[PDB]
Symmetry: C2
Subunit: 331 residues, 2 copies
């Protein structure tokens, strides 16, 4: 219902959030922050809103100083922020928060890269493959493409997806296809379970697999009580603030959609269904971004999601926006 | 309770809106639009949201083109936007919208002007005087000051208040004092009723004075059905704004709100100022909390309208890590 629309640089960004069936809304959205670099994010907090709101307000500060968006550089940036969060909000019982962050850069000239679909192979296992392995453990998603050399046209955007937790980012192509930019960090998955056990933790399933039978996520900012091993660095604790870092290219005709777990909780509503809703609403509404975000949010609520629901959509332009504006309206 | 906070340039701006007891929310807020000049605004629509939202999206397009924010130039800009609105959404039955717009210009060097309080005299009856005369026809507001020659320090902001309707803009000083940037456009006032009359219309009192017994406001964007006499500036309802010049210090707080915030009695200019000051203290300067709280008050005070508020704080230094954040509370 209540949507913010920012028209600036080479993008049109719309964002909205709702309490849903929860007493408070712990979701926070970084709508935009800065040469030729934009940073946007959706932070999903739990057990409090102090950490997610801190992240929204300060994540750009750390990521914004980076000269390259490599795993190593991004990793030190996230741990730096996490330490700052724990220091300022703790030291004990610090609320936690997921974080799906994107660093968007525009190409003013074409570039040649090796790619697997939209994922740029760094100069390796494509994320789509890893996601499909987890899903098997279907049919709604195409088989993983073979690597190929591609000339990414000027006007295209480089998108680095920095993920921590289970919020998600998706690129919807003009032809309807989609690229999954993130893979949820769950305690029961191999890499995560290994770290947890090494740090002296357990992974027990009640309603859902939980770390020490408490936390549903294996990675998150905050959550100070699960990072007190100190015989191990912060990056090897039960729960860590180390992100997965992947890069993809987006064409000016794409749509980038970031959403929290609340949108995908109904248990039917997967990446594919969300794409179908977006595609259908873009058609029916005649391309009104604000309405499509509002409709995907209502669908999730109507399908009985019991979580806060937040979505951010980004459309890209071939030319700089002439008259930038930031507008807040309803519907 | 959903707030947008934009930290950019030399300001921190927070905005929020709520349906309140209304079925829909037709308020639209222009949080910011561009050198060294901003534009911000609150548009309160009626009989539809198309017009208010159109204004938020395109007002700055027209105003931003201006070399100077004088009345002649601003009036041309507003009439142009109005024609465009009616041309795009009409011609007939176009929804209406009020408009409280502010053009903020930061000074890079001091300027010398003649002022009546914070109002700059063009090189005259101060706006405060008009408001006080109208309120009179026992004081919560100080007597109007004598004109003085002041040097506005660099780092200060020139603020042009462009009003069309009954939304309002207030400057809250660091010492608690307040400056009223606008005056409500009412159908029954001499200037308005006179124009309406000559246009073949009338003003009659029901729950409130109304144009032809229908519209609560005599000035607004859209409302094409009241602009078909055929000059645009002389129709029953017009989009000609009242334009006043002021100066704000980096220590002020600028508050823009729709009629919904002031609907309740006791919820007057002075009271909103009191609420804001109290909350800034109680929350140690949390702009988002003060915005939310002033809104809750209006609602608890039984306002039946949509509630929207925008607060702008100023800085002496350009923000170094600009952000636009949307959160709850
Ligand atoms: Pr959640
Ligand atoms: Pr109203």
């Amino acid at each position: 219902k209540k949507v913010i629309t920012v028209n600036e640089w080479y993008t049109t960004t719309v964002a909205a959030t709702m309490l849903g069936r929860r007493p408070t809304d712990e979701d926070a959205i970084l709508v935009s922050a800065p040469p030729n670099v934009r940073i946007k994010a959706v932070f999903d907090g739990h057990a409090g809103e102090a950490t997610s709101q801190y992240c929204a307000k300060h994540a750009a500060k750390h990521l914004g100083k980076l000269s390259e968006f490599t795993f190593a550089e991004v990793k030190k940036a996230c741990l730096s922020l996490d330490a700052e969060i724990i220091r300022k909000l703790g030291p004990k019982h610090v609320a936690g928060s997921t974080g799906i962050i994107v660093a968007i850069e525009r190409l003013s000239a074409p570039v040649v890269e090796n790619v697997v679909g939209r994922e740029i192979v760094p100069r390796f296992v494509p994320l789509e493959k890893l996601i499909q392995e987890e899903e098997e453990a279907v049919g709604r998603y195409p088989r993983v493409p073979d690597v190929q050399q591609k000339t990414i046209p000027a006007g295209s955007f480089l998108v680095t997806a920095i993920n921590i937790g289970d919020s998600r980012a998706t690129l919807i192509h003009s032809d309807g296809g989609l690229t999954r930019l993130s893979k949820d960090h769950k305690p029961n998955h191999p890499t995560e379970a290994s770290r947890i056990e090494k740090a002296g933790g357990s992974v027990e399933t009640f309603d859902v697999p939980r770390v020490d039978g408490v936390l549903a996520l294996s990675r998150a900012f905050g959550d100070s009580d699960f990072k007190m091993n100190p015989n191990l660095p912060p990056e090897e604790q039960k729960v860590i603030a180390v992100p997965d870092v992947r890069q993809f290219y987006a064409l000016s005709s794409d749509l980038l959609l970031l959403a929290c777990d609340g949108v995908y909780e109904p248990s039917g509503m997967d990446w594919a269904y969300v794409r179908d809703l977006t595609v259908a609403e873009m058609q029916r509404s005649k391309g009104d971004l604000e309405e499509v975000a509002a409709r995907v949010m209502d669908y999730a609520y109507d399908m009985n999601s019991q979580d806060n629901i937040s979505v951010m959509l980004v459309a890209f332009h071939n030319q700089e926006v002439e008259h930038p504006t930031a507008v807040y309206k309803v519907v």
